[PDB]
Copies of this chain bind each other. A is one copy, B any other.
Amino acid sequence: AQQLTPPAGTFRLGISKGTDSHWLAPQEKVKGIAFRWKALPDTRGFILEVAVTSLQQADTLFWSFGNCQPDMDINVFSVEGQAFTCYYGESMKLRTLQAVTPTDDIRLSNGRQDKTPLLLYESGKRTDRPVLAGRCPLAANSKLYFCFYEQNARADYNYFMLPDLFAKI
């Protein structure tokens, strides 16, 4: 019901209708589109359900993900289809955020060219710290889903298992 936030960074929602677009305000109402947010019980994170009934106000849904700390040493994204990974922090404290989106239409975009979703998506100006922008073409009587979560990086090998493993091979 109430907007939930990712384990890190800023997840922003926008809508377009033809050549018109704008970023949605925190509790902004959209004609034909409803937003339900549910917290993840196991790991840190959430699922968002975009319930599309009508395309009267919006033809497309837009989203943008950015780790808005210009002081951080590391901030990189890995995109695999409709999913992405964000590595943020420093070498001595590297954190991982994982996310799953409705479409594979994800672009490394310039966060300073974000006046509207359509300007961010078609942004191409040179940037050392890009943000991610996504395009979700909408359909009536359909549901779209998002998932932002953290993964416990279970290392397959520890130093104390290595001497036995070396002798075993």
The interface size of chain A toward B, counting residues with CB under 8 Å, comes to: 41
For the complex, give the distance between the alpha carbons of A87 and B89 in Å: 13
Interface residues of A in 68-106 (CB under 8 A from B): 74, 76-79, 82-83, 85, 87, 91-92, 94, 98, 100-102
A25 within 8 A of B: no
Which of A76, A79, A92, A143 has the most chain B CB within a 10 Å cutoff? A76
Contacting residues, chain B, for A39 (C-beta < 8 A):
169
Contacting residues, chain B, for A79 (C-beta < 8 A):
91-92
A47 to chain B, nearest CB (A): 5
Interface residues of A in 115-165 (CB under 8 A from B): 130, 143, 145, 147, 149, 151, 155-159, 162-163, 165
Contact B78 A76 (CB under 8 A): no
A162-B47 contact in complex given A92-B79, A169-B41, C-beta closer than 8 Å: yes
For the complex, give the distance between the alpha carbons of A159 and B102 in Å: 7
Could you jot down 10 A-B contacts, CB within 8 Å?
Answer: A36-B166, A39-B169, A47-B166, A76-B76, A79-B91, A82-B159, A83-B159, A91-B130, A100-B159, A145-B163
A100-B145 contact in complex given A76-B76, A78-B94, A94-B76, C-beta closer than 8 Å: no
Contact A91 B74 (CB under 8 A): no
Q: Mark A43-61, 1 if CB is under 8 A from B, else 0.
A: 1000101000000000000
